[PDB]
Design a protein around this motif. Structure first.
Motif, PDB file in Angstrom:
ATOM      1  N   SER A 150      76.377  78.289  63.361  1.00 36.21           N
ATOM      2  CA  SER A 150      76.925  79.256  62.752  1.00 36.21           C
ATOM      3  C   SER A 150      76.727  79.422  61.528  1.00 36.21           C
ATOM      4  O   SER A 150      77.072  78.179  60.366  1.00 36.21           O
ATOM      5  CB  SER A 150      78.307  80.051  63.412  1.00 36.21           C
ATOM      6  OG  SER A 150      79.046  79.048  62.432  1.00 36.21           O
ATOM      7  N   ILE A 151      76.703  80.843  60.399  1.00 39.98           N
ATOM      8  CA  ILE A 151      76.875  81.159  59.627  1.00 39.98           C
ATOM      9  C   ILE A 151      77.563  81.858  59.608  1.00 39.98           C
ATOM     10  O   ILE A 151      77.136  83.186  59.527  1.00 39.98           O
ATOM     11  CB  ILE A 151      75.598  81.012  58.229  1.00 39.98           C
ATOM     12  CG1 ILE A 151      74.407  79.858  58.323  1.00 39.98           C
ATOM     13  CG2 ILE A 151      75.384  81.372  57.045  1.00 39.98           C
ATOM     14  CD1 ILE A 151      73.087  79.918  58.341  1.00 39.98           C
ATOM     15  N   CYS A 231      79.774  76.950  57.336  1.00 36.49           N
ATOM     16  CA  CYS A 231      78.259  77.178  58.040  1.00 36.49           C
ATOM     17  C   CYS A 231      78.955  75.589  58.791  1.00 36.49           C
ATOM     18  O   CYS A 231      80.158  75.118  58.587  1.00 36.49           O
ATOM     19  CB  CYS A 231      77.033  76.772  57.103  1.00 36.49           C
ATOM     20  SG  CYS A 231      77.362  75.164  56.126  1.00 36.49           S
ATOM     21  N   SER A 232      78.212  76.185  60.097  1.00 38.11           N
ATOM     22  CA  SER A 232      78.193  74.687  61.082  1.00 38.11           C
ATOM     23  C   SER A 232      77.238  74.063  61.667  1.00 38.11           C
ATOM     24  O   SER A 232      76.394  75.382  61.915  1.00 38.11           O
ATOM     25  CB  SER A 232      79.547  75.089  62.109  1.00 38.11           C
ATOM     26  OG  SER A 232      78.799  76.452  62.867  1.00 38.11           O
ATOM     27  N   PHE A 233      76.547  73.619  61.884  1.00 39.33           N
ATOM     28  CA  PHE A 233      74.768  73.140  62.075  1.00 39.33           C
ATOM     29  C   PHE A 233      75.334  71.724  62.950  1.00 39.33           C
ATOM     30  O   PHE A 233      76.172  70.999  62.604  1.00 39.33           O
ATOM     31  CB  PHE A 233      73.949  72.927  61.065  1.00 39.33           C
ATOM     32  CG  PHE A 233      73.234  73.588  59.877  1.00 39.33           C
ATOM     33  CD1 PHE A 233      73.259  74.700  61.046  1.00 39.33           C
ATOM     34  CD2 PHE A 233      74.414  73.837  59.650  1.00 39.33           C
ATOM     35  CE1 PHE A 233      72.400  75.626  60.328  1.00 39.33           C
ATOM     36  CE2 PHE A 233      74.062  74.591  58.345  1.00 39.33           C
ATOM     37  CZ  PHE A 233      73.388  75.793  58.735  1.00 39.33           C
TER      38      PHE A 233
END
Ligand code: HG
Ligand code: HG
Ligand code: HG
Ligand code: HG
Ligand code: HG
Ligand code: HG
Ligand code: HG
Ligand code: HG
Ligand code: HG
Ligand code: HG
Ligand code: HG
Length: 243
Positions: A150-151, A231-233
């Motif tokens: 997500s961003i 952010c999360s990746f």
């Protein structure tokens, strides 16, 4: 006398509030007219014509001096106030330092999901997304997508951003509002794609998210003080710049 003057200039990170004063009690104002120009420029443009005595100027360049003037009607317009110059304040957008799973550029505005394990969301270093700002991300490099990607923006730094009190996009273009997916999708992000957030006045905000020349607009209900972004990746290689 010229019947109105600018009384207050409230400079904030996302714009300027101009407030004016009727300085002649004997004048009966029907309407006010506020203009502005960049101090570099040579032409005023109307920004507000109406009966209120303040106006919030949004979407101006930080760093940059603008000049404002105001007159009144109450028929011909009165002479202008003395001009007043203002600027939005500068609070740079940066990622948290020292969060496991992410490596930052020198100016702390580019984050890379590296090979380490990660706790969750990489947040902004503080809530530096302010009322009126256009918040822009650019995807510099990609990795394998995952629906935990997500961003977005959110109200609290909480120990992905698909959760309550947040708005975010995933790497497939899906958009989430307080944890719930919307029907309308944006195009999936690739290297070079930008994602832009614009937000407009509990509280109800209307959010415009723009990406790859498409946009979606919707209502966001949260409990407009400054916001975090994050952010999360899940997989390595994703790298995101915030402006
Ligand atoms: Hg006044
Ligand atoms: Hg006043
Ligand atoms: Hg006033
Ligand atoms: Hg100026
Ligand atoms: Hg005028
Ligand atoms: Hg604002
Ligand atoms: Hg948050
Ligand atoms: Hg998010
Ligand atoms: Hg999300
Ligand atoms: Hg807010
Ligand atoms: Hg992200």
């Amino acid at each position: 006398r010229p019947p109105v003057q600018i009384e207050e200039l409230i400079e904030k990170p996302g714009g300027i509030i101009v407030r004016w004063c009727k300085v002649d009690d004997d004048f009966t104002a029907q309407d006010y007219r506020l203009q502005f120009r960049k101090c570099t420029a040579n032409h005023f443009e109307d920004v507000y014509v109406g009966s209120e005595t303040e106006f919030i100027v949004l979407h101006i360049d930080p760093n940059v001096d603008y000049q404002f003037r105001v007159c009144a009607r109450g028929q011909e317009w009165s002479p202008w106030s003395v001009p007043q110059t203002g600027h939005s304040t500068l609070v740079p957008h940066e990622w948290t330092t020292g969060f496991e799973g992410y490596s930052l550029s020198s100016r702390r505005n580019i984050a890379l999901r590296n090979d380490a394990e990660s706790s969750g969301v990489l947040y902004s270093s503080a809530p530096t997304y302010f009322c009126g700002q256009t918040l822009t991300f650019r995807v510099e490099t990609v990795g394998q997508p995952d629906r935990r990607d997500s961003i977005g923006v959110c109200a609290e730094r909480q120990n992905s951003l698909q959760r309550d009190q947040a708005v975010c996009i995933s790497t497939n273009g899906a958009v989430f509002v307080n944890g719930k997916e919307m029907t309308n999708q944006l195009p999936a992000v690739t290297s070079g794609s930008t994602v832009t957030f614009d937000i407009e006045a509990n509280a109800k905000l209307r959010v415009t998210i723009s990406s790859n020349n498409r946009e979606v607009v919707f209502d966001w209900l949260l409990e407009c003080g400054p916001l975090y972004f994050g952010c999360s990746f899940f997989y390595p290689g994703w790298k995101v710049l915030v402006f």
